[PDB]
Amino acid sequence: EEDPDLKAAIQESLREAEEA
Ligand SMILES: [Zn+2]
Ligand SMILES: [Zn+2]
Ligand SMILES: [Zn+2]
């Protein structure tokens, strides 16, 4: 069982890193 909130938080982290 994967956790959609974990994945969503990491995906958000990736988008955020791409802003730099
Ligand atoms: Zn699983
Ligand atoms: Zn949660
Ligand atoms: Zn949640």
From Swiss-Prot:
Localization of this protein: Endosome membrane
Domain UIM residues, every copy: 1-20
Top-level division of the source organism's lineage: Eukaryota
Known role: Component of the ESCRT-0 complex which is the sorting receptor for ubiquitinated cargo proteins at the multivesicular body (MVB) and recruits ESCRT-I to the MVB outer membrane. Controls exit from the prevacuolar compartment (PVC) in both the forward direction to the vacuole and the return to the Golgi. Allows VPS10 to return to the (trans-Golgi network) TGN from the PVC. Might also function as an alternate adapter in the COPIb clathrin-like coat.
Additional detail: Present with 172 molecules/cell in log phase SD medium.
Similarity remark: Belongs to the VPS27 family.
Assembly and binders: Component of the ESCRT-0 complex composed of HSE1 and VPS27. Interacts with ENT3 and ENT5, the ESCRT-I subunits VPS23 and VPS28 and with the COPIb subunits SEC27, SEC28 and SEC33. May form a complex composed of VPS27, HSE1 and DOA1. Interacts with DOA1. Interacts with ubiquitin.
Domain notes: The FYVE domain is involved in the binding to phosphatidylinositol 3-phosphate (PtdIns(3)P) which is required for the association to endosomal membranes.
Name of the protein described by the UniProt record: Vacuolar protein sorting-associated protein 27
Lineage: Eukaryota, Fungi, Dikarya, Ascomycota, Saccharomycotina
Residue numbers of the full-length protein present here: 301 to 320 of 622
